[PDB]
Scaffold this active site. Structure first.
Site, PDB file in Angstrom:
ATOM      1  CB  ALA A  58      10.558  -8.330   7.633  1.00 27.04           C
ATOM      2  CB  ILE A  59      12.842  -3.149   9.549  1.00 28.39           C
ATOM      3  CG1 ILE A  59      13.435  -3.209   8.135  1.00 28.39           C
ATOM      4  CG2 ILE A  59      13.775  -2.371  10.455  1.00 28.39           C
ATOM      5  CD1 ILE A  59      14.635  -4.082   7.985  1.00 28.39           C
ATOM      6  CG  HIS A  97      -5.627   3.919   0.529  1.00 26.69           C
ATOM      7  ND1 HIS A  97      -6.594   3.598   1.449  1.00 26.69           N
ATOM      8  CD2 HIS A  97      -4.546   4.304   1.242  1.00 26.69           C
ATOM      9  CE1 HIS A  97      -6.121   3.774   2.670  1.00 26.69           C
ATOM     10  NE2 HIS A  97      -4.879   4.209   2.571  1.00 26.69           N
ATOM     11  CD  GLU A 147      -0.404   5.888   1.140  1.00 30.00           C
ATOM     12  OE1 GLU A 147      -1.105   6.611   1.883  1.00 30.00           O
ATOM     13  OE2 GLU A 147      -0.449   4.650   1.181  1.00 30.00           O
TER      14      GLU A 147
END
Ligand SMILES: CCCCCCO[C@@H]1O[C@H](CO)[C@H](O)[C@H](O)[C@H]1O[C@@H]1O[C@@H](C)[C@@H](O)[C@@H](O)[C@@H]1O
Ligand SMILES: CCCCCCO[C@@H]1O[C@H](CO)[C@H](O)[C@H](O)[C@H]1O[C@@H]1O[C@@H](C)[C@@H](O)[C@@H](O)[C@@H]1O
Ligand SMILES: O=c1ccn([C@@H]2O[C@H](COP(=O)(O)OP(=O)(O)O)[C@@H](O)[C@H]2O)c(=O)[nH]1
Ligand SMILES: O=c1ccn([C@@H]2O[C@H](COP(=O)(O)OP(=O)(O)O)[C@@H](O)[C@H]2O)c(=O)[nH]1
Ligand SMILES: [Mn+2]
Ligand SMILES: [Mn+2]
EC number: 2.4.1.40
Lengths: 290, 290
Positions: free
Chosen positions: B61-62, B170, B240
């Protein structure tokens, strides 16, 4: 450490297409149930060859059952783990009656002499696999497969079966409800399973796994059989009853479909079986057992 | 050593009845694909509690993404591995902006301060999980689960996912043919996958496994990303793309269905999904990323 697979060209698995809709292909504890059409053997062969996997196969041939060894071994050469390292362990009371069977490269056979019991013994096989051969197997093979000798291979039996612990669905009971399973039902036996318990009825003629897991299973079954003997009780289906109790309480990480243990004379060739891989050789039970 | 399961009463699995006929529930390398109806969570909870399993969850969490932590953590408390030991690892550039979330018993949270990168960085997460936290995780948890923060839990996410190595389908590509997958297609990148290769398109927002396997994956992806950087190329979908290359060459031992990574605003609620477990929180990509 597992090295990378090479580039491979094969059909894409499609999420919205099962191949098999007619059968359960995964247990409720997320173990695959191995049927034809569920595996790409090229991918699995790559995975297991990259680990230089060695598979041990144990088979007992005591008294008249030595007669089954030639067909058993010759057909194993045709169909069992071809391309992989294989070590057969033939347990017998008659080493001189073991047929000289020609093996493919990377495959070896050891003859292990044992004592013959008169009876339908429960105890020798589980005891031999655990107590006497423990150290040998740990040093020599990665997986152990334990089978009956009164059998022949007719089709592929390969690395798709390999996993920490597997059992095989008994061909007479795969469609049965659990209350009909011939589990040991006497509470006085260590193999006891109540009528409201049970996933499957596993056949005692084909189980296996990693060496460690097979030694755990065979040790536990041998110990439980010794308790029953001390208590003057013999489970209804002998070591198979104990195998079933073990696999109820210690879930197998794969389950083999009845493709892997079939009797065509008894049960024919149902639609659900696309291949008959490992099959009973007709025998006269009474004559051959005494 | 795995102790025995206790007696349990549950519905018998029936070999001639799949519950799920609408979807693929096992990969061609015999890895389960996890959908609702394929698992008995009572059996799995027993198995994993008997091993006193501890699950670590990593989340980054940046910059502005600290705003997502409250809902993420509060809903994790409701739905993620409830009854099991959980250790959250929150990586942030703003330790003081981590919300004080009340945890259930047996659950703990560590705040790990990192540096913030300006860009859509590829490299920090794979690097942080491998290079900096290697020793910590090995000592503290059995499994690691690595997820995006811009998410909320809406339903059960439990021990059914745990395995040596997993990826997640996905949600935009589970029905797509492989040629349409947005793999890296430039041969100059380490993440390159040709048009005739690929099993699935895995989302970078949810992967995991044993600590050892997750450290192998993250190390490999970080190394491959460093090679690309040295060669002046950045893969089309960043970490990814590399995750997808890794999982092509190192097959996962379970695959999570899109139940486990869904965007309802984008994709609705198709018949094939019986549960929406872990879902995107709507965001303005441009505003929140700068
Ligand atoms: C005319 C025989 C009828 C037998 C039907 C049921 O099976 C038996 O099931 C028992 C458990 O309830 C044990 O597993 C026996 O080993 C099995 O018979 C064995 O396996 C079978 C598949 C047959 O090959 C049979 O000849 C063999 O003795
Ligand atoms: C209006 C956005 C349309 C996006 C459709 C496809 O998805 C994107 O697929 C990319 C690979 O090709 C990457 O995985 C992105 O992270 C993903 O977008 C992410 O995941 C999606 C599921 C959405 O939640 C999207 O908002 C998010 O940025
Ligand atoms: O006199 C005997 C009886 C049994 N067996 C071994 O024990 C296994 C199990 O016995 P059997 O195959 O007779 O049982 P069934 O499959 O008919 O229940 C055999 O395959 C052999 O490997 C043996 O070697 N000699
Ligand atoms: O400014 C940022 C950008 C990204 N992230 C982290 O990187 C993940 C991946 O980015 P994002 O969710 O924006 O990608 P998307 O799912 O939209 O492709 C986020 O969930 C966060 O955990 C972050 O912490 N701060
Ligand atoms: Mn037999
Ligand atoms: Mn995201």
């Amino acid at each position: 450490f597992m090295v990378s697979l090479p580039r491979m060209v094969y059909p894409q698995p499609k999420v919205l297409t099962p191949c098999r809709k007619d059968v359960l292909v995964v247990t409720p504890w997320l173990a695959p149930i191995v049927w034809e059409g569920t595996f790409n053997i090229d991918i699995l062969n790559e995975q297991f060859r990259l680990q230089n996997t060695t598979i041990g196969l144990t088979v007992f041939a005591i008294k008249k059952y030595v007669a089954f060894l030639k067909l058993f071994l010759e057909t194993a050469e045709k169909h069992f783990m071809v391309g992989h390292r294989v070590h057969y362990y033939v347990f017998t009371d008659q080493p001189a009656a073991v047929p000289r069977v020609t093996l493919g490269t990377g495959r070896q056979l050891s003859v292990l002499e044992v004592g013959a019991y008169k009876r339908d013994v429960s105890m020798r096989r589980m005891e031999m696999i655990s107590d006497f051969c423990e150290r040998r197997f740990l040093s020599e093979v990665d997986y152990l497969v334990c089978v009956d000798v009164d059998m022949e291979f007719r089709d592929h039996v390969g690395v798709e079966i390999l996993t920490p612990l597997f059992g095989t669905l008994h061909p007479s009971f795969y469609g049965s409800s659990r209350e009909a399973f011939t589990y040991e039902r006497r509470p006085q036996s260590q193999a006891y399973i109540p009528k409201d318990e049970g996933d499957f009825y596993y056949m005692g003629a084909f189980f296996g796994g990693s060496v460690q897991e097979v030694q755990r299973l065979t040790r536990a079954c041998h110990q439980a059989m010794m308790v029953d003997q001390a208590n003057g009780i013999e489970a209804v289906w002998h070591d198979e009853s104990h195998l079933n109790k073990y696999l109820l309480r210690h879930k197998p990480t794969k389950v083999l479909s009845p493709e892997y243990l079939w009797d065509q004379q008894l049960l024919g060739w149902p639609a659900v079986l696309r291949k008959l891989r490992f099959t009973a050789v007709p025998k006269n039970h009474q004559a051959v057992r005494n």
